[PDB]
Amino acid sequence: IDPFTMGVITSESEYVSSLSAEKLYRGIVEDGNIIYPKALPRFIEKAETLEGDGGPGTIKKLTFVGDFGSTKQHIDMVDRENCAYTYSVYEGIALSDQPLEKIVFEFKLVPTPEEGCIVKSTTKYYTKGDDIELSKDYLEAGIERFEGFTKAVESFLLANPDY
Amino acid sequence: IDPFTMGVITSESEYVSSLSAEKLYRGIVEDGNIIYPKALPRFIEKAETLEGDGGPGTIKKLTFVGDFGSTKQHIDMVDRENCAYTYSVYEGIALSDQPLEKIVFEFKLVPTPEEGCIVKSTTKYYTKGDDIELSKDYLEAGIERFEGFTKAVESFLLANPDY
Numbered sequence: 330i331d332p333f334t335m336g337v338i339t340s341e342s343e344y345v346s347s348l349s350a351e352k353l354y355r356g357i358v359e360d361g362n363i364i365y366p367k368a369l370p371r372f373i374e375k376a377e378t379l380e381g382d383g384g385p386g387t388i389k390k391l392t393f394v395g396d397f398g399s400t401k402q403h404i405d406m407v408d409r410e411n412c413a414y415t416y417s418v419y420e421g422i423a424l425s426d427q428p429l430e431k432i433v434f435e436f437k438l439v440p441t442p443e444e445g446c447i448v449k450s451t452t453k454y455y456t457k458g459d460d461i462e463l464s465k466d467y468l469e470a471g472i473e474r475f476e477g478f479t480k481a482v483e484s485f486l487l488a489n490p491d492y
Numbered sequence: 493i494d495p496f497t498m499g500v501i502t503s504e505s506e507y508v509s510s511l512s513a514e515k516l517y518r519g520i521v522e523d524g525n526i527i528y529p530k531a532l533p534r535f536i537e538k539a540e541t542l543e544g545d546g547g548p549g550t551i552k553k554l555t556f557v558g559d560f561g562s563t564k565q566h567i568d569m570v571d572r573e574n575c576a577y578t579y580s581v582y583e584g585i586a587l588s589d590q591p592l593e594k595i596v597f598e599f600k601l602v603p604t605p606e607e608g609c610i611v612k613s614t615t616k617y618y619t620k621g622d623d624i625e626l627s628k629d630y631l632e633a634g635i636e637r638f639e640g641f642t643k644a645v646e647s648f649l650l651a652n653p654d655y
């Protein structure tokens with residue numbers, strides 16, 4: 330029958346940050362070039378803007394410390410008002426024998442009266458090909474890394490409010 | 493005057509393992525292809541031998557989960573009798589604006605009466621060029637990752653003696 334087939338696999342994780350939405354958002358989205366290497370000094374070597382002004386359509390690049398390469402982030406949505414940010418990664422994303430078309434990363438930070446904010450993180454894996462095999466470890470890996478970056482930045486900013 | 497100049501920067505870390513030298517060594521060196529992905533399921537996707545039989549001269553490759561590339565390990569010394577292992581990495585190793593010729597990784601596991609063994613880890617950074625600038629974070633990074641792999645494997649093997 331020869332159908333066109335695609336899988337979109339969504340993983341969602343939340344946690345409560347002590348840092349306010351606005352500060353966490355500014356740290357990652359506006360000051361990432363400075364803060365990513367300060368928050369993860371032994372993993373992220375450099376974060377820079379390759380193309381664009383910071384909004385939708387911007388291409389950023391993270392360079393990792395040591396023999397772990399580098400990756401471009403293709404910015405898709407930037408919503409300061411609602412502390413929402415989305416970007417895609419297109420290269421070097423095959424998960425074992427499962428090719429992918431893209432991985433999409435999205436967060437939305439929601440102010441909460443008790444603490445700082447609720448950090449709502451999503452990763453979406455878009456599959457290439459006619460079938461699908463993704464283990465729990467690989468699906469969890471993307472969302473753990475992504476939320477891990479956010480937690481590192483939160484922790485840094487709480488310890489050094491000077492940024 | 494035009495001298496030939498090279499830096500060799502050595503970082504050394506030790507800790508006491510509960511697992512015996514022989515088992516930790518076998519796990520990493522002989523059964524790495526199986527154990528590395530079990531010990532670090534969300535970071536190391538695959539560990540395979542590309543060339544050789546496992547001894548000196550063998551080339552192994554680690555593939556990392558997600559957009560973090562892959563790296564070849566060029567095996568230099570394999571000493572089962574003394575639980576010693578050395579390998580080099582040659583590619584993708586520039587540390588910021590400091591090019592490197594190679595990074596060498598070495599461990600020696602020494603049986604200890606109280607616990608299992610003393611894990612003696614070393615990383616050596618060989619610099620390319622006429623001057624040198626390496627921050628504490630980058631020097632610490634290599635040895636933390638390396639010792640981190642060993643600790644992950646130790647922990648896995650203690651929880652699953654079936655390997």
Ligand SMILES: CC(C)=CCNc1ncnc2[nH]cnc12
Nearest residue numbers: 400418470471474475557558559
């Ligand atoms: C599958 C997996 C472990 C993905 C992790 N990669 C990433 N996770 C979060 N943000 C990123 N930017 C570039 N690469 C990124």
Ligand SMILES: CC(C)=CCNc1ncnc2[nH]cnc12
Nearest residue numbers: 394395396563581633634637638
């Ligand atoms: C500088 C740094 C963070 C190095 C870490 N890289 C590695 N550390 C330990 N073993 C390895 N095998 C291949 N690459 C390896």
Ligand code: NA
Nearest residue numbers: 368369370481
């Ligand atoms: Na940190």
Ligand code: NA
Nearest residue numbers: 393394395396
């Ligand atoms: Na690097």
Ligand code: NA
Nearest residue numbers: 398399400401
């Ligand atoms: Na790259």
Ligand code: NA
Nearest residue numbers: 398399400559
């Ligand atoms: Na990459």
Ligand code: NA
Nearest residue numbers: 441442444445
């Ligand atoms: Na709040």
Ligand code: NA
Nearest residue numbers: 334335457458
């Ligand atoms: Na398809």
Ligand code: NA
Nearest residue numbers: 531532533644
């Ligand atoms: Na583990």
Ligand code: NA
Nearest residue numbers: 556557558559
């Ligand atoms: Na990969």
Ligand code: NA
Nearest residue numbers: 561562563564
């Ligand atoms: Na590679």
Ligand code: NA
Nearest residue numbers: 396561562563
């Ligand atoms: Na690599």
Ligand code: NA
Nearest residue numbers: 604605607608
């Ligand atoms: Na012992």
Ligand code: NA
Nearest residue numbers: 497498620621
């Ligand atoms: Na030189």
